[PDB]
Amino acid sequence: NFLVHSSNNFGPILSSTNVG
Amino acid sequence: NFLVHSSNNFGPILSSTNVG
Amino acid sequence: NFLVHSSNNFGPILSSTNVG
Amino acid sequence: NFLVHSSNNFGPILSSTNVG
Amino acid sequence: NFLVHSSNNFGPILSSTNVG
Amino acid sequence: LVHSSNNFGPILSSTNVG
Amino acid sequence: LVHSSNNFGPILSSTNVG
Amino acid sequence: LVHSSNNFGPILSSTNVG
Amino acid sequence: LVHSSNNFGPILSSTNVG
Amino acid sequence: LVHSSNNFGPILSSTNVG
């Protein structure tokens, strides 16, 4: 009996975003 | 008995977005 | 007995988006 | 007994979108 | 006993969309 | 033994120059 | 034994120069 | 024995130069 | 024995020069 | 025995030069 919401929402990976 | 929502939503990978 | 929603939504991979 | 929704929705791969 | 919806929806691959 | 698999293992992996 | 797997193991891994 | 797995193990791992 | 796993073990690990 | 696990063990570990 869970009746849960269980939001994991964001999981981003901004790897090596070599912004200049 | 789950009755769950279980939203994993975003999972992005912005790898090497070498923005100039 | 699940009755779940289970939305995985986005899974993008913006690999090497070398925006100039 | 599942009765599930199980939406995997987006799975995009914007590989090497070298936008100029 | 599944009775599922199981929508995989988008799976695009915009590879090398070298937009100028 | 039953499944509803939605697997995807992508690669995207080689010498990517910029 | 039942499943509803939604696996994905990506790689994105090689010599990425900038 | 039942599951609703949503696994993903990514890698993103190689010689990434900048 | 039941689950609702949402695992992800990423790596992101190699010689990253700057 | 039931679960609602939301595990993630990442690594991010290699020779990261700057």
Side-chain angles (χ1 to χ4, degrees):
Chain A
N1 310 57
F2 267 46
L3 290 79
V4 303
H5 174 82
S6 278
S7 164
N8 274 39
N9 205 287
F10 280 68
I13 297 169
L14 280 75
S15 61
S16 194
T17 67
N18 290 318
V19 183
Chain B
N1 310 57
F2 267 46
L3 290 79
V4 303
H5 174 82
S6 278
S7 164
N8 274 39
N9 205 287
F10 280 68
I13 297 169
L14 280 75
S15 61
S16 194
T17 67
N18 290 318
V19 183
Chain C
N1 310 57
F2 267 46
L3 290 79
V4 303
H5 174 82
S6 278
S7 164
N8 274 39
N9 205 287
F10 280 68
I13 297 169
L14 280 75
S15 61
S16 194
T17 67
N18 290 318
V19 183
Chain D
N1 310 57
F2 267 46
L3 290 79
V4 303
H5 174 82
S6 278
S7 164
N8 274 39
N9 205 287
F10 280 68
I13 297 169
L14 280 75
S15 61
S16 194
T17 67
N18 290 318
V19 183
Chain E
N1 310 57
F2 267 46
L3 290 79
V4 303
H5 174 82
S6 278
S7 164
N8 274 39
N9 205 287
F10 280 68
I13 297 169
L14 280 75
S15 61
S16 194
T17 67
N18 290 318
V19 183
Chain F
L1 188 153
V2 190
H3 295 285
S4 164
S5 280
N6 316 101
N7 188 359
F8 74 110
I11 288 304
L12 282 80
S13 88
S14 281
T15 61
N16 306 320
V17 189
Chain G
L1 188 153
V2 190
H3 295 285
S4 164
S5 280
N6 316 101
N7 188 359
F8 74 110
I11 288 304
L12 282 80
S13 88
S14 281
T15 61
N16 306 320
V17 189
Chain H
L1 188 153
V2 190
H3 295 285
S4 164
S5 280
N6 316 101
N7 188 359
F8 74 110
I11 288 304
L12 282 80
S13 88
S14 281
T15 62
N16 306 320
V17 189
Chain I
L1 187 153
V2 190
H3 295 285
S4 164
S5 280
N6 316 101
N7 188 359
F8 74 110
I11 288 304
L12 282 80
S13 88
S14 281
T15 62
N16 306 320
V17 189
Chain J
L1 188 153
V2 190
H3 295 285
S4 164
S5 281
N6 316 101
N7 188 359
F8 74 110
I11 288 304
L12 282 80
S13 88
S14 281
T15 62
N16 306 320
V17 189

